[PDB]
Curated annotation (Swiss-Prot):
Residues in coiled coil: none
Protein name per the record: RNA-directed RNA polymerase
Cofactor(s) required, per the database record: Mg(2+)
Purpose of the protein: RNA-dependent RNA polymerase that performs primer-template recognition and RNA synthesis during viral replication. Initiates RNA transcription/replication at a flavin adenine dinucleotide (FAD), resulting in a 5'- FAD cap on viral RNAs. In this way, recognition of viral 5' RNA by host pattern recognition receptors can be bypassed, thereby evading activation of antiviral pathways.
Lineage: Viruses, Riboviria, Orthornavirae, Kitrinoviricota, Flasuviricetes
Amino acid sequence: HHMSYTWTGALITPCAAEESKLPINALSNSLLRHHNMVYATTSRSAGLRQKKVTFDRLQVLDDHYRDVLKEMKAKASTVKAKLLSVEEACKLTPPHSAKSKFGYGAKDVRNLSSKAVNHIHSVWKDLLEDTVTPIDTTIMAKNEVFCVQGRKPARLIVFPDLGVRVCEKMALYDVVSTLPQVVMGSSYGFQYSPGQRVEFLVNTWKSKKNPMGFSYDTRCFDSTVTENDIRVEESIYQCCDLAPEARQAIKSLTERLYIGGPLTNSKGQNCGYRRCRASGVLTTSCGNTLTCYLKASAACRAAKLQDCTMLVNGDDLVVICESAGTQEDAASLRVFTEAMTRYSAPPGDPPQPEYDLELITSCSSNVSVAHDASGKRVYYLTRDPTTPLARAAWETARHTPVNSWLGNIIMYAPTLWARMILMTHFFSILLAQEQLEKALDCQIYGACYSIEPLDLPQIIERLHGLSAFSLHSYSPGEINRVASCLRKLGVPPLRVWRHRARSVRARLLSQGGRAATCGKYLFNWAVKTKLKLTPIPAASRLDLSGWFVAGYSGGDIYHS
Ligand SMILES: Nc1ccc(Br)cc1C(=O)N1CCC[C@@H]1Cc1ccccc1Cl
Ligand code: NI
């Protein structure tokens, strides 16, 4: 059998005590009252996950598959990519990346200490000399926060040692950063800020005489990825103009790490063996994106979809095409699904044809409509606020390595719920500790950034434009979704938030400087007598390079 996993019976074990119930402090009730709805996943559900993700993969590859692949390799052949030096790779490591098993940590790597650097050189040398020995990985259960829907089992994270991760950056950081946009062009989702994503989708939608669209949800995508898929990815990478040392490092990491390897729990026991995508390597995002695009492109051909345009972000897939009527479309999607299945990517929820752009969810998000200061209709990116709000409830009472609320304000700044609930609540908390100036870690497209909350108005103006501070008259469908979420979690109604916001705003203005700019721009929506919002001079000085270039989820990337 071609099983995604084989297991020894050893348990996936935790690294510390794990909390599953929402921690509660004196601030918790100001955000939500239904605490029993928020939970975190733990290793206790890791066995249930192992069950779901362990299956036999069969793959039948036809001429559409090979045709798309040759086209992809033709574009990949135009890419020239460079090896990073050790210092460069080290400086890309998150400060609290998991320490090495060889007696150094992420801080020693970042500081280029002799023990970290020497070992990295020794790992590199071993990669060039040995192209067969499977590389050990650690398997963990992720602790992630959700609202009961009741419970999702914990996801599994599979990752190699810190020295190897630095070596992966050296060989592949420039490749995974530049190749997907070259191969997939306008279809590569991670090149877009949220506004550009919205622009791409709307323009694509308008470019069809009779538009039809659908999202495609692969069942446990990482588990569907076969040895073939992973060797196909390597062959694409090798199309690049690369140093012969990078060629050798990439071959080696493919053979020894990417295709598969033994799994070790946190106690050092052998848990079994992986034959599918490792969720915590540098190539996780790029590999998944390339493989999802290959399979989907070939499936579009197989299904004879007319004038199909895709948007792919890792395992996340949206297709927009020419409609041929409701019946022909439902038929086409069934053929598309069959093709995908034959390629090892069967669906979770079966895909359905959609005739309203606003109702297509991709990357957990949708397009919606609001109005700017001049009353002009404006499209913007939004999402169901449930998960953002559950994580904020958790982050309200617990410090966490990644502040999802901050990532969410940045990505969803134009939304009704980010502005009325998240900015209000978190600025209120930060004021009360005078922690406005304290840099916080967050993630955007899987890479980690250290961000000062006082820089939000400028960050938002750079990413979303001044209109993100001006939007009004949101759509009934959006207002109803937000209101439904507030009922579910026991969040105070929007009117309470408006009230609180006038207070937060007044408090920030009182502080002058950057704090007062936050009060001015972020909360201008809260007062009847609205201030005049002008371009912020600090905004045009922001080094927002690399922000929306590529996706690095699982990839251990720090861009600060
Ligand atoms: N007109 C707006 C202006 C700013 C923001 Br943020 C949201 C809106 C907006 O469309 N709505 C509709 C539902 C909530 C909000 C209006 C509202 C209702 C009660 C209290 C405060 C507000 Cl801003
Ligand atoms: Ni076989």
